[PDB]
Amino acid sequence: SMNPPPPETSNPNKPKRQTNQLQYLLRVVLKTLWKHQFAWPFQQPVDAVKLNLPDYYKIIKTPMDMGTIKKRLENNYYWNAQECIQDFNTMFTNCYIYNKPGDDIVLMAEALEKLFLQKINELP
């Protein structure tokens, strides 16, 4: 039932880059998912305590969320767009691993993932 430390959004010895694809990821891909009606459960690390998911971090070993991704993009944390896309991917996959098909949270993820894949297709 306890919360690990959240994923790092800074790392001084990690090599950083600003690519036009990273800037799109923040301006278009994240900005869009963030405003969606189903974004709220993914805007911060899962709080296993408040949300009574005491098995969450017993099951999910690579947690990720949009609050973390957003800060990482804001902190120029990534080397390339693929690293960032990978964090979105981890976020979705965790949801599908942890919860059951037909859970409301799964239908939420599923709608953001459809939207995500549509906005990523238009990646410059």
Ligand SMILES: COc1ccccc1S(=O)(=O)Nc1ccc2c(c1)CN(C)C(=O)N2
């Ligand atoms: C039943 O609780 C919920 C159902 C749908 C959406 C959100 C909630 S909750 O925020 O009250 N609790 C919740 C319940 C389950 C999850 C999560 C949150 C977050 N998450 C990423 C996950 O994978 N499972």
Ligand code: NA
């Ligand atoms: Na650098």
